[PDB]
Design a protein around this ligand. Sequence first.
Ligand code: NA
Ligand code: NA
Ligand code: NA
Ligand code: NA
Lengths: 154, 154, 154, 154, 154, 154, 154, 154, 154, 154, 154, 154
Amino acid sequence: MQGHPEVIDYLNTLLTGELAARDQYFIHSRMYEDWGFSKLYERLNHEMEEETQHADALLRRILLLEGTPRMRPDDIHPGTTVPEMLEADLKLERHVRAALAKGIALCEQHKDFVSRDILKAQLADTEEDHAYWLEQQLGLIARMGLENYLQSQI
Amino acid sequence: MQGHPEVIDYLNTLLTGELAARDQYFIHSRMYEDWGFSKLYERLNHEMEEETQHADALLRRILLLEGTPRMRPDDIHPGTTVPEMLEADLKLERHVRAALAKGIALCEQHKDFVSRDILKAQLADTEEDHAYWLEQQLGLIARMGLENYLQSQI
Amino acid sequence: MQGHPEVIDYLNTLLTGELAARDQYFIHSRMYEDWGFSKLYERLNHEMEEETQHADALLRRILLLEGTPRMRPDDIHPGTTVPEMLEADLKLERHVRAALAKGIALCEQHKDFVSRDILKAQLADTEEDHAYWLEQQLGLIARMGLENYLQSQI
Amino acid sequence: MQGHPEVIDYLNTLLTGELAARDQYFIHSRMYEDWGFSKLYERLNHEMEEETQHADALLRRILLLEGTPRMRPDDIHPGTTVPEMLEADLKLERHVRAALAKGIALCEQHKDFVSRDILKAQLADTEEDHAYWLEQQLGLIARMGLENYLQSQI
Amino acid sequence: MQGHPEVIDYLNTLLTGELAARDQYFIHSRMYEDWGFSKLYERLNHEMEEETQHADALLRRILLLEGTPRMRPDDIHPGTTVPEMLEADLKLERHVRAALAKGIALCEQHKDFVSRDILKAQLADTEEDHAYWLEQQLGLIARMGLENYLQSQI
Amino acid sequence: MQGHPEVIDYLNTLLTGELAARDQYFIHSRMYEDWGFSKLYERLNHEMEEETQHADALLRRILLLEGTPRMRPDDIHPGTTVPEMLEADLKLERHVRAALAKGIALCEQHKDFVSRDILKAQLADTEEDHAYWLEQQLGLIARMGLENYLQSQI
Amino acid sequence: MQGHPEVIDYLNTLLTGELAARDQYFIHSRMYEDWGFSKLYERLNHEMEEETQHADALLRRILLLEGTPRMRPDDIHPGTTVPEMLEADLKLERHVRAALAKGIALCEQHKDFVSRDILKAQLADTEEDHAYWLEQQLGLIARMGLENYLQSQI
Amino acid sequence: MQGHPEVIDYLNTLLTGELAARDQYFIHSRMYEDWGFSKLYERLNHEMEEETQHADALLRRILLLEGTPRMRPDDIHPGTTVPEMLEADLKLERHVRAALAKGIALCEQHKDFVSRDILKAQLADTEEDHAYWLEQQLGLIARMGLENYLQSQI
Amino acid sequence: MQGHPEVIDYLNTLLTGELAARDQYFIHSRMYEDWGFSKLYERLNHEMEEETQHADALLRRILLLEGTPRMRPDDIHPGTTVPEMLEADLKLERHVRAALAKGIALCEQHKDFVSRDILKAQLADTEEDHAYWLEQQLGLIARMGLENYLQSQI
Amino acid sequence: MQGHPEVIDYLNTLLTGELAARDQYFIHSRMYEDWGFSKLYERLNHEMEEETQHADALLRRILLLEGTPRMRPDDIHPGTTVPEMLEADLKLERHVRAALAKGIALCEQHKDFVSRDILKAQLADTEEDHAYWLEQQLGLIARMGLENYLQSQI
Amino acid sequence: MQGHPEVIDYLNTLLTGELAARDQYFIHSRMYEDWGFSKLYERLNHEMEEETQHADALLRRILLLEGTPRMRPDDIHPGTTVPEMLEADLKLERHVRAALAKGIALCEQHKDFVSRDILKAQLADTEEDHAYWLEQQLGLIARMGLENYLQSQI
Amino acid sequence: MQGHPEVIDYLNTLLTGELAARDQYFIHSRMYEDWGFSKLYERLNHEMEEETQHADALLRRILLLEGTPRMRPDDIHPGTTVPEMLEADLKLERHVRAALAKGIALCEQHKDFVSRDILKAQLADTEEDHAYWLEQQLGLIARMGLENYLQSQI
Ligand code: NA
Ligand code: NA
Ligand code: NA
Ligand code: NA
């Protein structure tokens, strides 16, 4: 189907944003595992899987709309300590949420309601799972101290 | 059956007290879950379910006695921190225990032994489950510190 | 996440509206059961469960958005006869439908698409299940008479 | 064990009252079945079984207390039409409720708390099952007419 | 195979008659369901399925005979009340029965015995299931009144 | 419920469009089967089933909104060769997509968000299943030739 | 039973026609298998089995009617190439269809309705299975070329 | 449905003929069993069951056609020896075959093709099961002698 | 919870009475087993288990009420012959029954209805199981002689 | 463990090469699926999974060696037609094979035999699965023509 | 087979190194268990099992090569506190890694590729399991403190 | 892939060496079976299977490397007595071990690490299974005498 060139170009932006989010969760999960925090490894591995699915859905939609997917991920900036990693992931999800909301409005204005529903589902995922979960971890650290919290993630 | 108007009016008091206790456990459980304390979420969710059952039993008994149930819950005052929430729940159960004991005596004086047995069962629930469990948590905090304790509730 | 104060305040309005709808279905179901209409008991009990779920979803969303949930239900006005109860439930669902539609528009204007999707799901529930079912009952009464209809609900 | 002669004599009164209630439910169930109301047959047959159990519990308790059980049932007055039968059963349960409450007080005054707990259980049965159920039937008749109601009991 | 042009043209008439009968049972079933008569919904839904199968068999036979199927359904006239709907369905089946019998004779005269056996099977369906069932409903209404009958269809 | 007369009238337009799409997939599937292309038969039969479900959902929604469904399908124009059939189906889905998008906007303007969500689901079906699948077939023909492609559909 | 000598003589004609059709499908199936077309082997083997059943039914019917079955098959003319074989089978089924239709009329005129129903079943088999299937194959060849088609029959 | 008065009257003739055939197989089966021929008992019992089914189908068809079934069986003439019984059954089936064939023609002339198909099925039963089986027995007697044959039926 | 010091002190009395009853059933069961009376061993072992449960319930209740349990059992006086043992157990249960009844009244006067319900359950156990069973044994001895009775307990 | 800085830097090169190979197989698989070649989709999806595993193994090894993984994939150049895609994948695997062999020698020279064994396993995967499979496809195209080959990949 | 005397002598060195590593993990596991750290017990017990397997593989290989295995373990130096034990195990694995790498080079120079592959497998075990796991524990201690960490090992 | 002509030529040497080893184990196994030594038959049959697998792996690798496999086995020299056969197999495995080691070095020098890993696996098989097992047999003969040993192989 012939998609609107502005919608396609912006799905491509969301796509390279998701490819990056996938890769950031990729390296953070494996860093957590290397340090011996299996529960953090599991959760970030799950986020990596979810982003891979999001990227897949964008990519296929771009093809259906007869676009050419942009496959270069955005630049990533991983943490080097547990606090920096959590902060880097907090920045990432805030960014994806903001980009998605813009795409949601763009889709409405070009009357691409199906592309829009795809983005709204990804936004729900980003808020109610990624952001929600990350905020939980930050709050736990605040309530019990970093050491107690990291103990609980072994 | 025609219940004694004083018994009915007091079951209504207990009823609006239980509707409130249900709603307080409702908001506390969901607050604990939002902060990432799944074990506290589970336990307060269970207390919410038990209060809903207590309210149901009162409500049906009021109807059998040909009363009109009062469905407005009492005012609730939830905590905003884990310590305040535990204190608010401690105050609540002390109050329900006191109200139940009064109703138990009232039922005896109007020779409504069945209504009385219902209240005695609810009182046993309130003491041996809610109060007992809450006291356990307070004692644990006292023995290991708030941080260690909250860690154990993740 | 920091939700828009107008969205939060209005979810709170919807929340205290759902807590009320839950309690009205609560008392109506138990009244129908007391009179011996098990089929009406079952259906209103189901509506009570669904409203409890709706309230739960609002409450959690308010917390995720860093609001403070308002836990006092709105005032309820239950019927005293089967005809009044059905009329009271008809008024309730019309009201919830109207409040939801307003919230749906409000969410769009503050670009809270996830809160908006939650409300649209609740609206679909309210129309296609509660309103639809209640209209069916009223129509049946109209087609066969109140006595025949109540017989069928035993 | 040596029971108090006043408690024993009154358990005997309750006993001959239960033997009668058993026999009244006995004849009413079989009358309903003869007329083709299987649902009324089933329910009165169940009440007959429950009264037989109540009588059994009284009888054994009288023996444990070294009394001699009085085995003659009280006089019964069954109906001859469905309305009279329901009225006769309504009178019966009102009577058993009143006799039980008196025995409950008598047991307390002679410090026979175990005999008292037996009576309180029978009273709960009499109110929440027999009386409650019978009131339901009367209300149904009032709401839909005798003919519609009897149709529903086939 | 080269079918006789008169047989083909008449199968097309039967075909557009069946497409219509399908659509009339389609709207009547959904109307009955909307009003809360699940038993009528089920039965008309079944008739809709059977007509869809009849149309399918005609359509395929027309293709085997190297005809071009006419896919526009005949005009339909649904009822707006339960009595009108039953009357509309009574008129429909009388019409299909009459058209089928004519086609059965036509097939015999052009020595298309296989097309004829197809029509005889559809006629048996139309008489012994649709017509028979509809007549049963009309008779029931006549014997017990419309209100009692509609009660039984909930 | 009282639906907005403009929404109802337009659901009726979508409805008669779906009844047609159902019938076009109906005749195309059976034509493909007659020629011996079982894989095309299966897929078009599936599309026919999906359109029947779409029509059903519109029809019921029109009834809930207290409209009168229009049951005459739109005119259809089936192909006579495999290339014409694929082209006719390509034109059909383009048309349904365009009509749905218009209805989606209309529903928003009359604040019928539930009717709107129904249409958005049907649009997703039409794009991601029907249009997507049909485009795949056209592309395959282009890449391997019509003869090779039809061989693969036996 | 004493069958009409004209019916018996004509069942014998149909019988020796079926014995032949069996033998032609016999040799064609085995020729297709020898050349490596297993799918054609399977289908012609099935037709051979069906003709054997048809011959069996005729033979037994001739015996029940106290006739003497004629067991010599008609002359057969098998193809030597795939195109000739398909043409020979096309000629065969056209012939059996024509002979059956004549027998169907003959049976009616001698009031042998049971013999007639047997022939009508065989005719349905011959048209809707053998002729239909063979026409499908010819059409496929026409749409994709002989080479592509034979590839698909391996 | 309004059946043709001549068809109805003749189904009634067939009906009282089947009620008789049922009763003749009834007494013959039980006579064979009394004499110790269990295999003859089983087979005639089966024929009795089949005739009961035939009578049932006629009876229901007469009712659907708004006739009044004639329930008096025709006169029967059972045998008193095995040879007479077999002869009586041979006469019976010849008679039913003749009556059915006449009804089959009558149904065709009044365009009652469904009634006609019912009779053709019964005729097939009568020829291919009853007549065929009875002829087999007579032939066996002829080939091995009555004594050997009766031995084989124990 | 802060229990009333008089209730706590008296639960302690009941507690040291139960610890003793446990130990007396402990030694009697093992004495019966040593002499070869397995049935008496089993029954006294069961009573020992029940008393251990009673002591456990008192002990935990004392802790919930923030008392300090008194863990020294009362003095016990076991028998040395089967008759003395039965007499010692008869004296024990009479004593526990008397102490429990006093505690039941004490609990009522201090409005500790939950502690009271615990004691009433223990009293029911003591009367209907221990006392009842022991009286049965004494009666059996009286009816059949000590030798016959002891034979039956092997 | 402290890895040799030259080994770490080169694993990083292999790592960003694998992240790229993963992404190229990612887009090619989804392109093949969009065009309707499910068998090519499956195979490239499998290669994408295998590269993701290879990248994971490199990444973890880099962490164990106390390096910092480089997470930016190398530039990719996907095809736009089936022939270009196959050529792009042929170039990719030739490149990965060459880079791996160099790393294998480098690992040996720095006596990192474990890192070396990891690379040798990846090389075996790249040759015996990816390269081997791709060469097979190219050869098939050469032997049967592009059209026949693409037909076989549907 | 006649192994090279230098390879044999060095496998013997590796062998007495593994016998020691086995014994050190032996005493450390049992020390951890004695102190109540079951998770450390399990892991060191596993390492002891793995070293026993490594020693077994060396020993058998030495025999196949017609050497005489040296069975005296190297001297071990276990810790006396958790920190010293972890340090002693860190020193051990560093030593085994260094000895293995030397043997790997020695095997290559004497063209004993099978002995070399055995050592490379043991080295992979030593790095990716023992060293990796031990480093994880040290890092955890560093991130959460020794007390928190030891708590997690109970 | 384009393999190095020296590697290919040497894999061909190894290949014709394996084809021979297969054939020698082939004839020895069958000779042992003919003489009644089933245990020797089983073991040599297993070696034959393993060599066939080795030859297969070489052959396929030669094809992947775009070589032409040499399929003539090397000359074999089987024994004629059990002692000569064991000696012939001892010579064979010594030869294959020597040829493999040379190929392993050759592969390294041409940087064909995958071909090299294949050879190292075959060498491990040859040493640890074939050579090891054969040496065991020779040693057994030496320890118990040829007669005792052959007895054990029946
Ligand atoms: Na801690
Ligand atoms: Na009625
Ligand atoms: Na081709
Ligand atoms: Na004989």
